[PDB]
Every structure is written in C-alpha cells, then in structure tokens.
C-alpha cells in the first residue's frame, strides 16, 4: 500500500475538496466522527482505502489532505461543518487576506510568505506515509490563490519530492459563474509555470458542469454545491482505483503510463454518464451500451469540444456497478462502427477497461439519482485543445491593450512573464495540432 496526499488550494479547491471527502466517507462507510465499523484492524492497516485515510489509536480515519486558502471564510466552513471532526487543525491553513484574483499576488507577494508553512504541514502528512506515491492538487485557474499559489507549491513539491507523481484537478474558467475579468490571465500564467511540474491534469470546465446541472438535473440556476456534488462524482470515479482493490490505475504512475504518452499533452478529457435527476418520478435504468455510447456525446463531457475532429492517444473506461466484460466489449464494437474514433498512428487502437461492482454512491439529499451502473471515460484527445484556443484568444484580446497588467506588475511580477507564458501556450497549441491534424 502506498499513500496519496490531497492538496486543496483556494476557494474552488477547498469547496470541491469538501464535497469529495464527503463522498469518499459515504463510499468507504466512514462516519463524520472518523469511525469506520467495517475496519476490523483498529489503529492501523494497509488496505486500499488507507491510501487516502490514516488511522489513530482511537480508531479515527483521518484524510491525508491539506486545505490551503489565503482567506479564512471558506476553510472556516470545514472547521464547523458536518465533517469538522475528520480533520485536525494542522490540516487547515488560512491566511488573513486573499490574492484579489491576482496571480502575481498569490504566487509572489503572498505566496512567498506562506509557502514554507504549507510545505511544513505537508511534510507532517508525508512523515506518516511509508511509501508516498504523490499528490492530488485541486485548484481553480481563475482565482489568485488557485492559480498563483498553486504554481508556487508545485515548483517546491518537485524540489522536496523529486520522484513523486503529481496530478491536478483544475477548474477551467466559465463566465456564467466567473467573478473576475482577469481569469484568462491567471489561467494562462498558472498553466505556463505548472506545465513542467504536473504529470497529469483533469480539467473541468464550469460551463460544462453548469449546463449539465441545468439540462440533466433541471436546476435553473445551479449553485457551487450543485456543481461540486457533480464534480466529486467524476473525481471519485477517477480516484476509485486508488482506494479500492483492483488492477488498473493502482498507483499514480499508472495514470501517466496509461493516459499520457507525450509529457506536455497531459490533459485527458473526462466524460461521465449517466446523470439523472433525483426529483425524477423514476428513470429507466440504462444499459452498458447506452451509457458507453453516451461517453461520445459532447453533452456529458467535462469540457465542451468535438472529439470527432481530434485524434485519440489513449482511452480508459471506468465502470461502476452491474457491469460485466462481455457487455463492455459488445458496446465498444457497436460504437466503433458508428462513431468517428481516430487514434494517432503511433498508438494502439484499444481501450483499457476497469470495472468496480459497487455502483455510484449518491449523497443523501443530493441532486443525483441512484443508478445501477455508471461509467467515466478518460480519453486523451487533441480536441481538448479547443479549450486552450478559446482561453488564449481572450488573453490576446486584453493583453494587446495591456489591460489590467499594472495590477500584476504592481505585485512584483515582470511584464515579460505575460509574453513568456503566452508563447508557451502557443507552443502547446502547436503540439496538439502536430499530433491531431494531417
């Protein structure tokens, strides 16, 4: 057994982190007080769920998690929330004033003065690990902390934990819920400085989660709670292999081996199905082919884009519930003959499949309905480059006038870091084009 430490940075990271550990607990039968009746080894053990939870003598199962935010209001909810008892105070770190949606403020001005403290708190968690695999880092692109401080933390982690893997869950900015005009600046600044430090990153576009909540869940004006409950279902599907017995994606390294043959192109597209409204009278349970086929519909992708006009480099199918290999292979054959699935010529045309028999756990009172089987597809498509193009375009629009640049220079960042970061993105878009288009 090898441990995984989760790091939640900024409001988006912390609130999403709160929704995941809530879900993890329901999945592993852990109560709010940390007790786990099914764990017959009191005060220790090296089971699969131990990769995310440690144990105390009293029998408490404590997440291997750190919450960091430069402002205390979001993390104060964790201290007095339903799962206030899971974490001890060392795990929750809060400053006094945030980064004001300013990358340079989170990375430099405020980051420099708190980075050593965060590392110390992470070091404490690492010292409980007998074979640490790496880190899962949750953060937003658009926030000043999520963007600016995260890239600083990733740089130091690559220094203090050289041979450790680092995966990201990043929130791509969407105006329908965005609260800052400069989020394109922050997203591109944080991608540039984090690109060489992240082994695999799962981008979630708020626009997609928003439209899924309105379309499938019939929520006219989704809230962050609605968004986070859905995001933690996808996240849970991606991390289940690390928390349960299995043979696929058993450690963080396998994520890079199976999803990222080229290092810079490490942003797999996530697709999830089905998402059924709990308020529904009673839905007809979908088959393996129907939910598998849904994985190739833009409507349930974590980032709206057209995989028909890209090339696949890898494809993982992660099933949960009543599913048998016979039915997966049958559906896949049917999809090949109907869908436009093009693989890069230097990669095999195949699908790694993982099946966990336990169906998705739904949060009591949540919005999602209980389903008998669900799937999350992870595919590395060049089509996700549409998201970089969108973002790089908005960047070009504002930077052409130097709009808002003085806020960043005022925090000690050199203006040349803008163009340096933008040129890196231009090289990233060129990489996708060289792999996907003929």
């Amino acid at each position: 057994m090898r441990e995984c430490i989760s790091i939640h940075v900024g409001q988006a990271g912390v609130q999403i982190g709160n929704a995941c550990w809530e879900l993890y607990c329901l999945e592993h039968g852990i109560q709010p007080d940390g007790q786990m009746p099914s764990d017959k080894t009191i005060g220790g053990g090296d089971d699969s769920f131990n990769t995310f939870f440690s144990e105390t003598g009293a029998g408490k199962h404590v997440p291997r998690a750190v919450f960091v935010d430069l402002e205390p209001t979001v993390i104060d909810e964790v201290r007095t929330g339903t799962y206030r008892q899971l974490f001890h105070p060392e795990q929750l770190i809060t400053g006094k004033e945030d980064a004001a949606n300013n990358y340079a403020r989170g990375h430099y001005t405020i980051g420099k003065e708190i980075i050593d403290l965060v590392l110390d708190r992470i070091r404490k968690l690492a010292d409980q690990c007998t074979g640490l695999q790496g880190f899962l880092v949750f953060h937003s692109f658009g926030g000043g902390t999520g963007s600016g401080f995260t890239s600083l933390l990733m740089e130091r982690l690559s220094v203090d934990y050289g041979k450790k893997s680092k995966l990201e869950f990043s929130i791509y900015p969407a105006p329908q819920v965005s609260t800052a005009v400069v989020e394109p600046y922050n997203s591109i600044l944080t991608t540039h400085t984090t690109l060489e430090h992240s082994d695999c990153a799962f981008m979630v576009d708020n626009e997609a989660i928003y439209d899924i909540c309105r379309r499938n869940l019939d929520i006219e004006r989704p809230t962050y709670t609605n968004l986070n409950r859905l995001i933690s279902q996808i996240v849970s599907s991606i991390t289940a292999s690390l928390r349960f017995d299995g043979a696929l994606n058993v450690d963080l390294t396998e994520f890079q081996t199976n999803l990222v043959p080229y290092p810079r192109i490490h942003f797999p597209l996530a697709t999830y199905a089905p998402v059924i409204s709990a308020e529904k009278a009673y839905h007809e349970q979908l088959s393996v082919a129907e939910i598998t086929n849904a994985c190739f519909e833009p409507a349930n992708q974590m980032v709206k884009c057209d995989p028909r006009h890209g090339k696949y480099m890898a494809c993982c199918l992660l099933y949960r519930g009543d599913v048998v290999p016979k039915d997966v292979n049958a559906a896949i054959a049917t999809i090949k003959t109907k869908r436009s699935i093009q693989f890069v010529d230097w990669c095999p045309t195949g699908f790694k499949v993982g099946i966990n028999y336990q169906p998705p756990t739904v949060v009591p009172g949540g919005d999602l309905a209980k389903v008998q089987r669900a799937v999350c597809m992870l595919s590395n498509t060049t089509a996700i480059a549409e998201a970089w193009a969108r973002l790089d375009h908005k960047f070009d629009l504002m930077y052409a006038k130097r709009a808002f640049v003085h806020w960043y220079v005022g925090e000690g960042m050199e203006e040349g870091e803008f163009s340096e970061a933008r040129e890196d993105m231009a090289a990233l878009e060129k990489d996708y084009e060289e792999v996907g288009v003929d």
Binding site: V159, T349, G350, K352, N356, G412, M413
Partner: protein, 54 residues
C-alpha cells in the same frame, strides 16, 4: 477485438481490449525569483514615498 490482461477480484475486474495495432528550477533559483519580485515591489514603493516626500 482481443482481450488481454484480464484481472479479477472480489470488488471488480479489469482488462484491455486492443482493436487494431499501431502504425526544473532548484530551491535557490526559486528563492531568487521570489526575492527579485519582492525587490521590484520595494523599489516601486520607495518611488511612491519619494514622490510623496516631494
């Protein structure tokens, strides 16, 4: 349409289907960057105070 590496356990199973074959900065360098930005901030604030002193 081949199925390889089928692994089964109590809580699930996993396999692979192949349809078709194929065809950093050091700790010192980070402190400099951080201290460089801190110095540019100090310089700008010194000019602002110099301006206010005039």
């Amino acid at each position: 349409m081949e199925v390889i590496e089928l692994n089964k356990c109590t809580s699930g199973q996993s396999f692979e289907v192949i349809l078709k074959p194929p065809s950093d900065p050091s700790l010192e360098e980070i402190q400099k960057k951080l201290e460089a930005a801190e110095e540019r901030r100090k310089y700008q604030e010194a000019e602002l105070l110099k301006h206010l002193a005039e």
